[PDB]
Design a protein around this ligand. Structure first.
Ligand SMILES: O=C(OC[C@@H]1O[C@@H](OC(=O)c2cc(O)c(O)c(O)c2)[C@@H](OC(=O)c2cc(O)c(O)c(O)c2)[C@@H](OC(=O)c2cc(O)c(O)c(O)c2)[C@@H]1OC(=O)c1cc(O)c(O)c(O)c1)c1cc(O)c(O)c(O)c1
Length: 205
C-alpha cells in the first residue's frame, strides 16, 4: 500500500487523481475514501472541506484537480513548489504564470531538495505535517504582540499557526496567512513550500 511505500504516518493524504477523494492511512494501510458531496479534500487541512474553500478542486469537471492557475489564484512567488495532490508532480511559478511539471518514472518530487529524486526510504514528505487549528484563535491582547515583546519592524513567525506570519509595523501587530498551500519558514522569514519543516512533519516521522 502507498502508506508504507512512502514511509507515511497514519493520517490523510491527497488522492492524486480525484480531489473529491483522498487516501486514508489507517493501521499503516491505504484506503481510498470519498469526501461527502459538497466537500472536497483540502490539502492544507488534510481533511474534506467545503468545496468553496478549495478552488483548485473543480468538482464539476471530469478531471477536477485544476492547479493550472495556482500561482495566480493563490499568489505564489517564483520558484518550484510541491504539487498539492500529486507527489510525482510539481509546480513552476514565474511572474504569476503556472507550469505543471512531472518527475520521471520511479521519481518523486522532493520539496526540500527542490527537484525530482529516486524513491528512497521515506519520501513524499511534503504531505506529512500538522495543520494549524481550525479556526486559529488568537488570545485577547494579541493586537499588542509586537509592542509587548519589543519585536522589530518587519516579519516574524506567528506562534499560533505555521500557515501564518506576524507583521510588526509602527509597533502595530498584524497576522496574515501565507498564500494557501504555503507555510511560514521560521529560518528564512518567508512563506514557502516546506510544510514538512514548517508545520512539524519531522516529529511525525
Ligand atoms: O485565494 C483563495 O483562497 C485563499 C482564502 O480566500 C478566502 O476564502 C475565500 O476566498 C472563499 C471563497 C469562497 O467562494 C468560499 O466558498 C469560501 O469558503 C472561501 C479567505 O478565507 C476566508 O474564508 C475568510 C475568513 C475570515 O475570518 C474573514 O474575516 C474573511 O474576510 C475571509 C482567505 O483567508 C483569510 O483571509 C484569513 C485571514 C486570517 O487572519 C486567518 O486567521 C485565516 O484563517 C484566514 C484566504 O486567502 C489567504 O489566506 C491569503 C492571504 C494572503 O495574505 C495571501 O498573500 C494569499 O495569497 C492568500 C481563493 C481564490 C478564489 O479565486 C476563489 O474562488 C476561492 O474560492 C478562494
Amino acid at each position: 500500500n502507498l502508506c508504507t511505500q512512502y514511509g507515511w504516518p497514519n493520517g490523510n493524504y491527497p488522492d492524486p487523481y480525484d480531489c473529491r477523494k483522498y487516501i486514508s492511512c489507517n493501521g499503516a494501510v491505504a484506503t481510498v475514501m470519498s469526501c461527502a458531496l459538497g466537500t472536497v479534500f483540502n490539502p492544507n487541512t488534510r481533511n474534506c472541506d467545503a468545496y468553496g474553500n478549495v478552488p483548485i478542486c473543480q468538482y464539476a469537471l471530469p478531471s477536477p484537480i485544476v492547479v493550472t492557475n495556482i500561482c495566480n489564484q493563490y499568489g505564489w512567488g517564483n520558484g518550484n513548489f510541491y504539487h498539492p495532490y500529486n507527489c510525482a508532480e510539481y509546480i513552476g511559478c514565474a511572474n504569476g504564470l503556472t507550469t505543471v511539471n512531472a518527475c520521471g518514472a520511479g521519481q518523486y518530487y522532493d520539496q526540500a531538495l527542490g527537484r525530482c529524486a529516486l524513491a528512497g526510504t521515506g519520501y513524499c514528505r511534503q504531505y506529512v505535517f500538522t495543520p494549524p487549528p481550525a479556526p486559529v484563535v488568537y488570545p485577547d491582547g494579541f493586537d499588542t504582540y509586537c509592542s509587548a515583546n519589543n519585536l522589530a519592524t518587519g516579519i516574524h513567525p506567528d506562534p499560533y499557526s505555521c500557515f501564518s506570519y506576524v507583521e510588526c509595523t509602527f509597533g502595530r501587530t498584524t497576522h496574515m496567512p501565507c498564500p494557501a498551500g504555503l507555510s511560514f519558514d521560521r529560518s528564512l522569514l518567508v512563506c514557502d513550500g516546506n510544510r514538512y519543516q514548517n508545520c512539524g512533519g519531522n516529529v511525525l516521522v
